[PDB]
Design an enzyme around this catalytic site. Structure first.
Site, PDB file in Angstrom:
ATOM      1  N   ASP A 100       0.813  -1.221   0.000  1.00  0.00           N
ATOM      2  CA  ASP A 100       0.000   0.000   0.000  1.00  0.00           C
ATOM      3  C   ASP A 100       0.851   1.279   0.000  1.00  0.00           C
ATOM      4  O   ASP A 100       0.754   2.067   0.941  1.00  0.00           O
ATOM      5  CB  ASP A 100      -0.995   0.107   1.160  1.00  0.00           C
TER       6      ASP A 100
ATOM      7  N   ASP B 193      -5.470  -9.672   8.430  1.00  0.00           N
ATOM      8  CA  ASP B 193      -6.579 -10.629   8.538  1.00  0.00           C
ATOM      9  C   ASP B 193      -7.557 -10.174   9.609  1.00  0.00           C
ATOM     10  O   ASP B 193      -8.770 -10.346   9.467  1.00  0.00           O
ATOM     11  CB  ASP B 193      -6.101 -12.024   9.018  1.00  0.00           C
TER      12      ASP B 193
HETATM   13  N1  LIG Z   1       4.679   9.150  12.066  1.00  0.00           N
HETATM   14  C1  LIG Z   1       3.832  10.105  11.673  1.00  0.00           C
HETATM   15  N2  LIG Z   1       4.193  11.401  11.848  1.00  0.00           N
HETATM   16  C2  LIG Z   1       3.351  12.365  11.455  1.00  0.00           C
HETATM   17  N3  LIG Z   1       2.150  12.250  10.886  1.00  0.00           N
HETATM   18  C3  LIG Z   1       1.811  10.948  10.726  1.00  0.00           C
HETATM   19  C4  LIG Z   1       2.588   9.858  11.087  1.00  0.00           C
HETATM   20  N4  LIG Z   1       1.910   8.681  10.764  1.00  0.00           N
HETATM   21  C5  LIG Z   1       0.788   9.089  10.239  1.00  0.00           C
HETATM   22  N5  LIG Z   1       0.657  10.461  10.178  1.00  0.00           N
HETATM   23  C6  LIG Z   1      -0.465  11.227   9.672  1.00  0.00           C
HETATM   24  O1  LIG Z   1      -1.637  10.824  10.350  1.00  0.00           O
HETATM   25  C7  LIG Z   1      -2.776  10.947   9.469  1.00  0.00           C
HETATM   26  C8  LIG Z   1      -3.501   9.628   9.408  1.00  0.00           C
HETATM   27  O2  LIG Z   1      -2.557   8.607   9.024  1.00  0.00           O
HETATM   28  P1  LIG Z   1      -2.915   7.090   9.247  1.00  0.00           P
HETATM   29  O3  LIG Z   1      -3.593   6.858  10.599  1.00  0.00           O
HETATM   30  O4  LIG Z   1      -1.681   6.296   9.049  1.00  0.00           O
HETATM   31  O5  LIG Z   1      -4.038   6.757   8.165  1.00  0.00           O
HETATM   32  P2  LIG Z   1      -3.996   7.280   6.683  1.00  0.00           P
HETATM   33  O6  LIG Z   1      -2.596   7.372   6.206  1.00  0.00           O
HETATM   34  O7  LIG Z   1      -4.659   8.693   6.609  1.00  0.00           O
HETATM   35  N6  LIG Z   1      -4.811   6.175   5.721  1.00  0.00           N
HETATM   36  P3  LIG Z   1      -3.953   4.709   5.618  1.00  0.00           P
HETATM   37  O8  LIG Z   1      -2.524   5.056   5.099  1.00  0.00           O
HETATM   38  O9  LIG Z   1      -4.607   3.819   4.623  1.00  0.00           O
HETATM   39  O10 LIG Z   1      -3.771   3.887   6.947  1.00  0.00           O
HETATM   40  C9  LIG Z   1      -2.228  11.440   8.130  1.00  0.00           C
HETATM   41  O11 LIG Z   1      -2.414  12.847   8.008  1.00  0.00           O
HETATM   42  C10 LIG Z   1      -0.755  11.028   8.193  1.00  0.00           C
HETATM   43  O12 LIG Z   1       0.086  11.921   7.480  1.00  0.00           O
HETATM   44  O1  LIG Z   2      -0.913   0.907   9.412  1.00  0.00           O
HETATM   45  C1  LIG Z   2      -0.934   0.001   8.653  1.00  0.00           C
HETATM   46  C2  LIG Z   2      -0.298  -1.351   9.024  1.00  0.00           C
HETATM   47  C3  LIG Z   2      -0.807  -2.525   8.481  1.00  0.00           C
HETATM   48  C4  LIG Z   2      -0.260  -3.761   8.787  1.00  0.00           C
HETATM   49  C5  LIG Z   2       0.814  -3.832   9.656  1.00  0.00           C
HETATM   50  F1  LIG Z   2       1.349  -5.058   9.958  1.00  0.00           F
HETATM   51  C6  LIG Z   2       1.330  -2.666  10.219  1.00  0.00           C
HETATM   52  F2  LIG Z   2       2.390  -2.782  11.076  1.00  0.00           F
HETATM   53  C7  LIG Z   2       0.784  -1.412   9.902  1.00  0.00           C
HETATM   54  N1  LIG Z   2       1.303  -0.165  10.470  1.00  0.00           N
HETATM   55  C8  LIG Z   2       2.722   0.174  10.503  1.00  0.00           C
HETATM   56  C9  LIG Z   2       3.653  -0.675   9.923  1.00  0.00           C
HETATM   57  C10 LIG Z   2       5.002  -0.401   9.958  1.00  0.00           C
HETATM   58  C11 LIG Z   2       5.447   0.766  10.557  1.00  0.00           C
HETATM   59  I1  LIG Z   2       7.533   1.126  10.547  1.00  0.00           I
HETATM   60  C12 LIG Z   2       4.525   1.645  11.133  1.00  0.00           C
HETATM   61  C13 LIG Z   2       3.162   1.348  11.107  1.00  0.00           C
HETATM   62  F3  LIG Z   2       2.258   2.205  11.666  1.00  0.00           F
HETATM   63  N2  LIG Z   2      -1.581   0.215   7.368  1.00  0.00           N
HETATM   64  C14 LIG Z   2      -1.828  -0.618   6.160  1.00  0.00           C
HETATM   65  C15 LIG Z   2      -2.736   0.412   5.666  1.00  0.00           C
HETATM   66  O2  LIG Z   2      -2.354   0.837   4.397  1.00  0.00           O
HETATM   67  C16 LIG Z   2      -4.181  -0.033   5.820  1.00  0.00           C
HETATM   68  C17 LIG Z   2      -5.154   1.026   5.285  1.00  0.00           C
HETATM   69  C18 LIG Z   2      -5.180   1.074   3.802  1.00  0.00           C
HETATM   70  C19 LIG Z   2      -5.319  -0.276   3.163  1.00  0.00           C
HETATM   71  C20 LIG Z   2      -4.310  -1.287   3.675  1.00  0.00           C
HETATM   72  N3  LIG Z   2      -4.315  -1.353   5.158  1.00  0.00           N
HETATM   73  C21 LIG Z   2      -2.274   1.350   6.718  1.00  0.00           C
END
Ligand SMILES: Nc1ncnc2c1ncn2[C@@H]1O[C@H](COP(=O)(O)OP(=O)(O)NP(=O)(O)O)[C@@H](O)[C@H]1O
Ligand SMILES: O=C(c1ccc(F)c(F)c1Nc1ccc(I)cc1F)N1CC(O)([C@H]2CCCCN2)C1
Ligand SMILES: Nc1ncnc2c1ncn2[C@@H]1O[C@H](COP(=O)(O)OP(=O)(O)NP(=O)(O)O)[C@@H](O)[C@H]1O
Ligand SMILES: [Mg+2]
Ligand SMILES: [Mg+2]
Lengths: 304, 276
Positions: free
Chosen positions: A144, A171
């Site tokens: 992704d 899953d």
């Molecule tokens: N480590 C980080 N530092 C700063 N902003 C972050 C970080 N991780 C995520 N974000 C921000 O948090 C918001 C939501 O991110 P997240 O919860 O990962 O879902 P998402 O990216 O919007 N959709 P998805 O990528 O499918 O999981 C976005 O505006 C990201 O840019």
């Molecule tokens: O957050 C996750 C996620 C999923 C599986 C997993 F094993 C993780 F460890 C995950 N997070 C994560 C991993 C490594 C680091 I370094 C920091 C993190 F936060 N996502 C996958 C995602 O794209 C959703 C939403 C969009 C469609 C597909 N699933 C967004």
């Protein structure tokens, strides 16, 4: 595939991770909303970002999630955000990771108008190098890659995030969200066998969106590209599968860049460029040996 | 503007509410005592005149229902914002749990038999002009051969979809006939999707698959992939587990791409009779 200035920061992050021991809820104080919240560890002076995935299932599966999740302590790269630990608390599993003060390029693109070509070249090296690391050293694909999960900082690193490390955590997820911007490859949409090529398609499409300032499907008519310079989910997806892929406007971008995306956006994944090819593409050879103050461009546009 | 519990033919003096039976996306459902009953509490806007009378439309209809394969609808009381639907309590387990329980054997004779029960119930509801709109194995109950259909009609008033990103539950998309799949958007509203008797038959097809494979179709695939594959009419079969042609031909019929080619529940009942 090794540098020194990068060498200094990796152990330093490792040294920082020494601080953590173990994690649980009361160690952490909510600072703000970014779902993931920026939070402050008190047992150790670190500012981290902690993401809360709501899962509700019995512990035998949750223990499998965390063991599979523990491998991220081992993958460590200048092109991947840094990992600290995963525990379960009160019907939500928490992943807390390195905090990146610049946000996602999704979020950076909102504040900028469009992202200029030379910065986009740099980000291309970062992303391409991250997947190659993952594929070659952990035999994992991202599954992704798109702007919201690629993070940037005022120190100037660009790294990948949110990749598929635990087959079972995906899953365990009860429900997914589908909006109108899809980055899924044509071959994944059709449910056929796929590889890191799917990530390469996702990378091409992200690059064109950032260069033009608009998600490029359906392609704009003559009226809106002029000014730049109501669709159902199924028919957007069918556009991706059956209409010809998006392309950069021919006027405003170098040929090397255009050809770079065109090679990413080939529908047949066997003909799509693979990871090493792009490392030898003209566009990133040119961009590799270039001087852009990425940190400077960032802070000025975002205000820091 | 109001529905009181004395409007019903079930004489009701007192209603006790016990523990919550489980979590779910539409209201909360508790144990109750009247005998024992299942009480589903729903919240509405204080004055959403639109949806309140829409809701009442549906519930007077349920008052005319009584059929051995449909859960006994007992009553509904209104007082905004708080609404309640009171049904009979199902002993036993949902069909969802039974199929996924390794200790229960589900031979081809028994699957034909379970399927036939669901069809009888559905043809009754259809005969009374009631569409289910959310037929699925979590909405069927099985206790040593007694099969009952529940939660019919609820989806109209449900709000289980509720910025610019539509929420999709596992299992949902693979029950949706193509005409519906091709219309989901983040603007989509439960009360305006083109449900029909044909869409209900499609949903029964997914249950037939699930009865024999003991898992949902498209189990592997993410939502976007499922939408595209189902919207263009790609569907699995049961030859990978050695199921004969007859058990697979029902799916070819129930999952037919153009709706008018799918059978009514009356014809389908006949087709199920003719299995070995
Ligand atoms: N480590 C980080 N530092 C700063 N902003 C972050 C970080 N991780 C995520 N974000 C921000 O948090 C918001 C939501 O991110 P997240 O919860 O990962 O879902 P998402 O990216 O919007 N959709 P998805 O990528 O499918 O999981 C976005 O505006 C990201 O840019
Ligand atoms: O957050 C996750 C996620 C999923 C599986 C997993 F094993 C993780 F460890 C995950 N997070 C994560 C991993 C490594 C680091 I370094 C920091 C993190 F936060 N996502 C996958 C995602 O794209 C959703 C939403 C969009 C469609 C597909 N699933 C967004
Ligand atoms: N008539 C009933 N008798 C016994 N249990 C019931 C009855 N109706 C619902 N339940 C249970 O109550 C819980 C909530 O059910 P419900 O709100 O209908 O959601 P669900 O059908 O399980 N899945 P979903 O509709 O996708 O959220 C589940 O554990 C059901 O099995
Ligand atoms: Mg994310
Ligand atoms: Mg239900």
């Amino acid at each position: 595939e090794l540098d020194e200035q990068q060498r200094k920061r990796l152990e330093a992050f490792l040294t920082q991770k020494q601080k953590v021991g173990e994690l649980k809820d009361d160690d952490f104080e909510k600072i703000s909303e970014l779902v993931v919240f920026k939070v402050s560890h008190k047992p150790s002076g670190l500012v981290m970002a902690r993401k809360l995935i709501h899962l509700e299932i019995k512990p035998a599966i949750r223990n499998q999630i965390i063991r599979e999740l523990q491998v991220l302590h081992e993958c460590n790269s200048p092109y991947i955000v840094g990992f600290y630990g995963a525990f379960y608390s009160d019907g939500e599993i928490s992943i807390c990771m390195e905090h990146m003060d610049g946000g996602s390029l999704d979020q950076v693109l909102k504040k900028a108008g469009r992202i200029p070509e030379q910065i986009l070249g740099k980000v291309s090296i970062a992303v391409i190098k991250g997947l190659t690391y993952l594929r070659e050293k952990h035999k994992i694909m991202h599954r992704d890659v798109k702007p919201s999960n690629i993070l940037v900082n005022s120190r100037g690193e660009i790294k990948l995030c949110d990749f598929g490390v635990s087959g079972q955590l995906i899953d365990s997820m009860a429900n997914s969200f589908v909006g109108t911007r899809s980055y899924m490859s044509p071959e994944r949409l059709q449910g056929t066998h796929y590889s890191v090529q799917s990530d390469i398609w996702s990378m091409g499409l992200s690059l064109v969106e950032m260069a033009v300032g608009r998600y490029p499907i359906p392609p704009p008519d003559a009226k809106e590209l002029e000014l730049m310079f109501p669709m159902a989910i199924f028919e957007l997806l069918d556009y991706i599968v059956n209409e010809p892929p998006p392309k950069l406007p021919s006027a405003v971008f170098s040929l090397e860049f255009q050809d770079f995306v065109n090679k990413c956006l080939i529908k047949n994944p066997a003909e799509r460029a693979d990871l090493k090819q792009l490392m030898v593409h003209a566009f990133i050879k040119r961009s590799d040996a270039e001087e852009v103050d990425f940190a400077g461009w960032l802070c000025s546009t975002i205000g820091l | 503007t109001s529905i009181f519990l004395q409007e019903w033919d079930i004489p009701f003096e007192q209603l006790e509410i016990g523990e919550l039976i489980g979590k779910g996306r539409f209201g909360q459902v508790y144990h109750g005592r009247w005998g024992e009953v299942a009480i589903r509490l729903i919240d509405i806007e204080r004055d959403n005149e639109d949806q309140l009378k829409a809701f009442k439309r549906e519930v007077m209809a349920y008052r005319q229902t009584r059929h051995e394969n449909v859960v006994l609808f007992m009553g509904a009381c209104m007082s905004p914002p708080h609404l309640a639907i009171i049904t009979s309590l199902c002993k036993g387990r949902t069909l969802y749990s039974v199929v996924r329980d390794a200790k229960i054997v589900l031979d081809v004779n028994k699957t034909r038999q379970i399927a036939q029960e669901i069809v009888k119930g559905m043809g009754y509801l259809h005969a009374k002009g009631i569409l289910h709109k959310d037929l699925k194995s979590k909405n069927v109950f099985y206790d040593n051969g007694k099969v009952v259909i529940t939660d019919f009609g609820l989806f109209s008033i449900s709000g289980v979809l509720q910025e610019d990103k539509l929420r999709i539950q596992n299992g949902w998309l693979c029950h949706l006939a193509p005409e519906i799949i091709r219309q989901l958007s983040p603007d989509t509203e439960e009360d305006k999707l083109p449900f029909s008797k044909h869409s209900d038959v499609f949903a029964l097809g997914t249950i037939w698959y699930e009865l024999h494979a003991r898992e949902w179709p498209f189990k592997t695939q993410p939502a976007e992939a499922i939408i595209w594959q189902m919207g263009t009419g790609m569907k699995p079969n049961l030859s990978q587990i050695g199921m004969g042609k007859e058990i697979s031909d029902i799916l070819l019929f129930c999952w037919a791409f153009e709706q008018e080619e799918r059978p009514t529940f009356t014809k389908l009942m006949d087709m199920l009779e003719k299995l070995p």
